[PDB]
Amino acid sequence: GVGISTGTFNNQTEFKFLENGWVYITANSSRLVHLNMPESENYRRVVVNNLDKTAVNGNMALDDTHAEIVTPWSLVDANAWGVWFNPGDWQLIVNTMSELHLVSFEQEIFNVVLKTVSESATQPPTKVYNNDLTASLMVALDSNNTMPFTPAAMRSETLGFYPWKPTIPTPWRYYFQWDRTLIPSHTGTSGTPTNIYHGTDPDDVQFYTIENSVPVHLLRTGDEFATGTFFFDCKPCRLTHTWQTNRALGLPPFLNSLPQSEGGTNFGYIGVQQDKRRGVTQMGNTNYITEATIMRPAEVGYSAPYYSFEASTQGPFKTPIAAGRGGAQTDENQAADGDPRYAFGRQHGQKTTTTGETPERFTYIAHQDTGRYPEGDWIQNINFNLPVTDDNVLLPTDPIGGKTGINYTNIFNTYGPLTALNNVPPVYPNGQIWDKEFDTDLKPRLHVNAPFVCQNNCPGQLFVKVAPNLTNQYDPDASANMSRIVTYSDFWWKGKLVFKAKLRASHTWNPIQQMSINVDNQFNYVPSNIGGMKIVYEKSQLAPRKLY
Amino acid sequence: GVGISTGTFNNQTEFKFLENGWVYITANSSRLVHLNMPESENYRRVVVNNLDKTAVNGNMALDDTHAEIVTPWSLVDANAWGVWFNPGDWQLIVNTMSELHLVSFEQEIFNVVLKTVSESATQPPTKVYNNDLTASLMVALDSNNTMPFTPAAMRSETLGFYPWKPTIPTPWRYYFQWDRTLIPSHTGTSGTPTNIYHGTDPDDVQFYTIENSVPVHLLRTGDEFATGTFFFDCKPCRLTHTWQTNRALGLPPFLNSLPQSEGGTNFGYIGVQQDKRRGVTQMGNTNYITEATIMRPAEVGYSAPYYSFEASTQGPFKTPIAAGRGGAQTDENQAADGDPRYAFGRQHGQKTTTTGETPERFTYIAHQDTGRYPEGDWIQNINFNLPVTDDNVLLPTDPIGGKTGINYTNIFNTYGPLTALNNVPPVYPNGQIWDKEFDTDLKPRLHVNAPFVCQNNCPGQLFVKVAPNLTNQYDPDASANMSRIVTYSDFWWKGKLVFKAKLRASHTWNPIQQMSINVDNQFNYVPSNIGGMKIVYEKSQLAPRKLY
């Protein structure tokens, strides 16, 4: 009814420990969600065009041309790690657990409140807010996944990460098909590169509406909505990283001479000439057996063209890579391709008291060593006459195409049947948790944006809207915009995310890396004197595991 | 007890024929294993560094820098074909069988003998050997695979291939994490290329010890150890090779004119103009239908950058390839990338009476025709105007990067969704049998070092050690090395490897290739007048099978 609550606030994470080292981690997340009535009650097909920016030669990477259907609905998205765990919970998970499973998801809307705003004609602004007890909130659960999948974490538009801070839903929109051509150029190109937007292909048109595709529930102040429990079928997520490169696979060479005194200058020596050694190599025309030429079971990681942009029907897009750059751990400035960069606002980890539109940014460096150091790569002749001469070796400094800033590694691909790689680690708090699998016939082996992928399906998107609150002067025949009473809603969203995790075991004599609070990061986890909070990112795959 | 044997010597291979053309091949292998007490009773973290060798410009491929934990334990490894089969058994297998399955593995240690050495003070050396009836041999079976996987076949350090020749175990060591950077150079580079060893990443440290990870059994002269039967879950291994290239897939063109007289100069002719023919091609802008342009179901084999070295956290390593070079069968000198080269000593096939540290070497040429002949490759313009002109074709002789010894094929990768390839053939006697699968999330489609791969796990590594035999003057507080009575052990190792194989069938009118003894190789299988034995390599995939 009007004066009866329809739900309870719960934001507790429970760790129920099972037998055999397994734990059920049920994270509860409760938020107060504020929603305004849509700017327009219609669906719009809006073409965003920034040909001015890309008309500058060399700016083709800044292309934003696209077409989107803007809908009157808003999306309630909780597909981010920060929506579910605080730094203490994440510390417990990443320190005491070795693998993580995604078990189930539930969400519900309760304690719906709808208020109308009456603004007076007095010259200084003044307004009052009245409860509209008969107003309704339109809630649609796309449990069949009919609507396009538009996760908000990629735009930093999920629910807020603070239980005590009210959050908002994101206005929903989806991509409409378009055709676009953009010939790349550079500073110094003469003429106007081909840069046109060709329109839309009629055979690819797909105009979706929530009304025609999903059942819609009208919730009054005394109503509540529950989606029901959804159960995932994803793969386990490892909370351990691998450190072994191809150089550290298998049996090391026997050292016939060992150091007689400790110290950094004292080295063990194999004691056998490199061309007189025993072993197996894939180089059938050389007698040298070294750490770089000896046979290994397979290849850890792969090389791909980095900062390569491929053009397709809808324009250019960067070629993704599964693994981050090698050497970003020895030198943090080397983080670039494959090291995801997260930019977020005050709702999602940035200092809440900051002013301005500049977001808080961080580049994530994974502990796994599956990356590549292209500056140390090279190609050489099949003859393999050592030491190699100039014409028989292609080095990373050799120009490709006549460009001194482009080398073969930029266009180099080593993906093959022997490539072995890991899934992307969870990124806390701004990383996505689960992502829908592509509906293609042949599917990618992994996604670079979420550690869990939906093989069959994952829970339907939740859409909310303020039902039209018409005045007495509504005329559907009029071409002017619908006249509505200014209405807004505040409702409580509660979600339950259930994981299954395995407790880690100590395999080595030495201790391992753990996340800990210290003097440097001590104040990143507590509020300031005025209430300013923040959530800094945390690494997940802290403990190491042996690859081979 | 002291005077009671605890096992029997068995080195027989049994072929028990089943119904429906299947045979159980149980190979028994018995060896006398001699073990010396470890040089040191401690674990050492030894850094092998050869910066002197790689400081020579162009010698970066000879990098041996690495770090290893040297343990006081020795590894008993029987993961090689020669440990289980003699040339007659291998001939029977490769001639009468079409596929091979790895069923089970057992090993055991018995008839343990421990002897102490007493050396006299007399000026001419003289010594006696006494049985230490109360001395113990420490045996650890890592059935849980907690320790790093270090197969010895890659170093030619498995058990000997001769039943009547006593063998030794290999001292065990494993790779410790390290960071290394090496900028490639060539003869003619000016300056000192960046060449440093950066140390160890604390987050990747993994110090393993047998004592803290595996149960240890103390075997006295009257004790024996049995691991128990382990059962594999690997894929079948084909003993047949494929000969069909993309040029030999599907229906050949109809010959409207056939030769009227036999002879090498008389050819059949299609009789239709290449641009007037019927068929399907993937080239949508050409009317030519030829043997090189006609559509095929998929691609057999693939091209990859050969003799490409990729650098990662721990230095440079050669990029592996699944298939060997094409044309190595028409010209044995073309064997290079992908054709494994085996180097071994007198225990593993080399003439036992040879003197010197030079190993016996051979490059393996597989009968399967999945390789590539890069000298016959080329790229040309999408326009496809024939005959192609200079600027519209990139040939294998065209310099890439300005280097006349490097062409596009050196950096060329054609692996894709249409690539079809075979697993590596068994290499007798020096090839590995089974290999552990990588613990990565995404796993390689095959391993280039063993025909069988351990999906879940494969039998734990066996470690042996001589238990410390202290003197009366032991003082654990002393910083000097432990003083031990010089002790060594001789024990009998018996293993049983069970395979399941299918008998081959005659599918064609003509006979097929079989391994046979002849005048040229007659004396490669019998001892010399002084007992000198050898085991030359044998090819496995002799018979052909149709790919399509």
């Epitope: 400035n333 | 003619g188 580079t189 000016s190 960046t194």
Partner: antibody, heavy 122, light 110 residues
Framework: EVQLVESGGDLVKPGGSLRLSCVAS????????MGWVRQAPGKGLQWVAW????????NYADAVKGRFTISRDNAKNTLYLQMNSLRAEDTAVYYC???????????????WGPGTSLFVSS | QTVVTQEPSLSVSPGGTVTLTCGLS?????????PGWYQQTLGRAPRTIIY???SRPSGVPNRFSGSISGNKAALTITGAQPEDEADYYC??????????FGSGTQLTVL
Amino acid sequence: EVQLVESGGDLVKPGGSLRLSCVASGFTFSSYNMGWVRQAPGKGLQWVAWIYGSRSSTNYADAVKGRFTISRDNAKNTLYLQMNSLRAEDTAVYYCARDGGSPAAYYGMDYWGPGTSLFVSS
Amino acid sequence: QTVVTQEPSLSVSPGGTVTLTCGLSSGSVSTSNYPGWYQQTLGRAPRTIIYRTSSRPSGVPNRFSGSISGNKAALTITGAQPEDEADYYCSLYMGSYTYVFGSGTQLTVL
């Protein structure tokens, strides 16, 4: 945009010490390898010191090894060159140098400061 | 010790083409040396003309071109203007993290 300003150059007697300070603006200071070059009065440019990497690894020319120390403070966006046991041969104009390649270094001085003169005389 | 040799002095008429060369007494200059060219006027700090043997910083006129000729680095000024008269210094990356500088070439526009 990218600006480098050097200061601390002053007359100093032989055998003394002096710290040159280089203030950088218009760019992320910690993301670029920095260095100190020097030009003697009437002579050509000579590389003095280089600081590179997130670990602040340092390399020095043979003429200043053991005597010069190159450091950086990214909080202050400052580069410090501390010279000890100064000689008459160290008298010169010292230029701040910034490499423009953060993830792929140009291995060359992308930006230069106005320079600070140091005179060593008894 | 590494020594970089370049022409002590060079001359060019207005609107002409001149080439300044930078070599090594022992060895050859390649793209692995990342040759850099810097321009210095009297009483002013050096200005970067070329980096990575071909790249001129934004604002550098196109008349300056960097290349590798023979076993040396080459800086070519085409249509040389009066303001191009200055001391041009060549920097070679000598591996590891060591840099070397040439003696310098005094280019005067007639």
